[PDB]
Amino acid sequence: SRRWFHPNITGVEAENLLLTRGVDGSFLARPSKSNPGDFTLSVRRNGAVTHIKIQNTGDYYDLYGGEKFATLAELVQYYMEHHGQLKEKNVIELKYPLNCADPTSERWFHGHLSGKEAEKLLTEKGKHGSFLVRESQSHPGDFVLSVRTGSNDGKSKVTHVMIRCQELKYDVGGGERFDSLTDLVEHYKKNPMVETLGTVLQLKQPLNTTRINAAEIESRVRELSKGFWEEFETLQQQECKLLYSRKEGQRQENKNKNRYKNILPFDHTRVVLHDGDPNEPVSDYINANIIMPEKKSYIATQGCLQNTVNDFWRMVFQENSRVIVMTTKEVERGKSKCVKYWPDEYALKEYGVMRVRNVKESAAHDYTLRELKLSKVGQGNTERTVWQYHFRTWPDHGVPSDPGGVLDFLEEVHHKQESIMDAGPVVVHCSAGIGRTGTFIVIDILIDIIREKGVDCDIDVPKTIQMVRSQRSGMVQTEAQYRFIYMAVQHYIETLQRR
Template sequence: MVEKSGIVVHLKQPFNATRINAANIENRVRELNKVADNSEKPKQGFWEEFEVLQQQECKLLYPRKEGQKPENKSKNRYKNILPFDTTRVIIRETDSDGPGSDYINANYIRNTREDERHAEESKVFIATQGCLQNTVVDFWKMVHQENAHVIVMTTKEMERGRNKCVRYWPDLHTSKEFGKVMVRNVEEHPAQDYILRKLEVTRLDRKEPLRFIWHYQYLSWPDHGVPVEPGGVLWFLEEVNRTQSTMKDTGPIVVHCSAGIGRTGTIIVIDILIDIIRRQGLDCDIDVPKTIQMVRQQRSGMVQTEAQYKFIYMAVQQFIDTAQKRLEEEQRSKMKEREYSNIKYPQMTNSRSKHNMASSRSSSVMTNDDSSSVYENINFKTPQTSFSSNTRRSDVVWHLSERDCHKKTGKKEGEITAHQMAVCLRLKNRFVSKK
C-alpha cells in the first residue's frame, strides 16, 4: 500500500484478507454485519465474501466422469451434484464385475491445510448424499468397508412433502438385511434436537465380531435456511465427537443430508475450524473462506448458501465466546488458589508450633461447642473422666483457673497461648453462669 506522500506501507495482512485471529472473531463478524453506506454497492459483508467464494468455485474443474457414466446416473439423487473422481469413495467389495459396481456418490473430506504436526490428529469425514432406494445396499457396504462407527444425518426423511433420504435402518428392536449386512436397531434415545440410535451390524457371509454404529439424526435444521442460533448444533457436534473419540481405530465419520453438500458441508467446516482452535488455542489463525474452499476441492458445492456461510461464523464465534468465558473462570479460580497458597506464616519453634496448631484446630471445633474436644486441645482430660459425678461446678471452675492452666499445660507464666487462656476463661464463665 502506498500513502499519498509516496511512503510504501507494508501490511502484515491485507484489508480484504479473510484470515483472522480466532480470539478476534467478534470484531470480524461485526465488520461483516455492517450495512454498506455506499448506495452503488448495497451488498457487502457476508454476501460479498460468499460471492467471491462462489466465483472461485467455478474455477474448480476436477473430473467427475464416474458419476456421469450411464450406469451410475440412477445412483445420483441430483444430476448436477456428482463426486470428484480424485476423492470419491470406491466400493472395493462388489457383487459383480459389472460397470458401476464400485460407485457411490460420496467423497472423503480431510483437513489438507493442516501442518504435519497435526495431520495425524485430524479427523476424516465421508460426505455423501441421502440414500436412494437403489443405493442403500451400497451405503452399508461403504460404512462396513470404511470401518465407520458414527453416522451423522442432518435431515429428516421427508421435508416439505419431498423425500430427502430413504430410511436405511430398521425400526426399534427389529432387524433388516441390506445385501450381506444385517442391521439391528438396538436402542433409540430422543434428545432435544436429535435422535441417537445404536445399531448392531453383522456380516451374513462370514463370521466377524459384532460392530456397533452410532447414528445421530439432527432434527432441528429447518427445511430452508439455518437454525436460529448455533448452540444446538455445537452441543450436537460435541456429543458426536465424544462418541467418535471413544472408538479405537475407528474409520471416518459419515455425514449426509439430502444432496450431501449444504448442511453436510456446513457441519464439516464448523467441526474442522473448532478442531483447529481446540488443538492450537484461541490465539491461532482461522480462515473461514479458505476452509470452505479446501473442502470444495474434495467435494463440489460444499456450503450452498449465504445463510449457511454466515451460520459457520456464528457457530465458531459462539464456540470461542464459550471457550473464553470458561478460560477466564478457570483463571479466576487459579488466582484465588494462589492467593491462599501465597500466605506466609512466621517461623515458630517446635514447641510453640505444636500448641498453635492445636489452637487452630480448636477454633474450628469451638463453633460446634464441643467442650470435650476443646479440653483435649489444651491437654486437659474431659470433665467426665477428671472429676467424679459429685464434683460441684464451683470446684470445676477452680480447676480451670489461670494457675491450673499453667499447671496442666506444663507452661510457665507468660508461655501459655492467648487462645488457650481464652478457652479457660470461656469455660469458667459458662460454669459460673450455670451455678
C-alpha cells in the same frame, strides 16, 4: 470462468447489456439481491431477453425449467456443452458469456485504501509476490497496483504501479489497454513487469484479508455484520478453479445411483467400493467423497435412495466408519430427502451382504441417537457399533438463528468419534450431500483447530471452505450458511472463554 457473473447488475442493466453488447445466445447470471439465494440467468434469444430464476434455499441451485446444480459454474458448464437442453415453459441457448468488468469480487481488489496503509498490510501480511489493487486517492478514477518483492533488513520492498483508467479501458501508462482490471491483472500475471534494474514484479498471490485470530472472532463478525455478502461472493468467484472431472458419476450404469443427475462426486476423491457383486455391471460407485482437512476425516454423501441403501452400508463397513451424521428429516415439504436405511428400534434387518441391528434409540431435544450394530452376513467377528446422530429440527429452508443446538450436537458427535480407537471417517449426509453436509463439516474442521490449539489460533473460513470444495462440488451452498459458520465458531469461542 465466472466472468459471466455480474454481482452488482440490476435487471434493466442486464437487459440493456445483452441487447447492446451481446447477441442471440449471450447470457449472464446475477444475484436478485433482495432475497439472498435468488439468482437470475439472463439470456438473449430471437432479439428478446429472457430472465430465468435460480433458487437456493441451502441444498442446491434449482434452475426453473432446468436442473439442480452444485455450483453456478457447474450449471453454466453443463448448458454450454448441451445446446437444446434448456427451454422455457412453452429451447434457450447459452452460447456467449457476457463478461463483467466489475473488480469487486477479486481477492486482490481492496478498493478503499491508501498507499501507506497498503504498504503496512504488505509489510505485515505479504510475502514475495504478494499484491493488491487499490483506488488512487491522488488521481480520482485511477487505481494503483502495490506488490511486495525480494526480519526487516531491507531485502524486501514494496512497489506501487499507477494504473490509468482512460475512456473505459485500463493501462499501466503504456502498451496494451484492457477492458477491466481483471484483464490487466491476468496479463501482467503471465507477462510480469520488470523494473529497468531488473526486479521482476511477479504477481504470485493476493494479500490474505480473511485469516483471523480466533481470539477476536467477535470483532470480525461485528465488522462483517454491516460484509458477509461481499466475502461470500469473493469466495464464490473462485469456484471456477474447481471444475474437476466427475466422469464416474456420469456413466450410464451409475445414472440411477445419483439423487440429482448433475450433482456428482469428483473422480479424484470419490469413495470407491470394493468386494461387490460380480453380476452387477458397475458395483464400485456411490455418490460420496472423502473429505480430508488440509486427523479426523469425513465422507460427505447424499441421502440414500431405495436402490443405494445396500451401497451405503458397503461404504460404512469398508471405510470402518463408526459415526453417521444425518442432517435432514427423511421427508421435508412432502419430498423424500433420504430413505430410511436403518431398522426400527430393537429390529434387525439385512441390507444385501450387510446386517444391521438397531440396539437402542435415545431422543434428545434436537436429535435422536441410534445405536446400530453392523456386521457382514455369514462372518462373525465383523460386528462393530455405528452411532447414527440424526438431527431433526433444522429448518426446511435457511439456517437456525441460534447455533446452540447444532454446537451441542456437534460436540457430542465429536466426543463419540474420539472415544473409538481407529474409527474411520465420520459419514455426514443430507439430500444432495453438499449444503447442510458441507456446512456441518466446515464448522467441525474450524472448531477442531480451536479444540487443539486453544482460543489464540489462526482460522480462515473461506480458505477452509475452498479446500473442502476442492474435494466435493459446492460444499456450503449459501451466504446464510456462510454466516452461520461464523456465528457457530463465535458461540463456541464465547462459551470457551467463559469456563
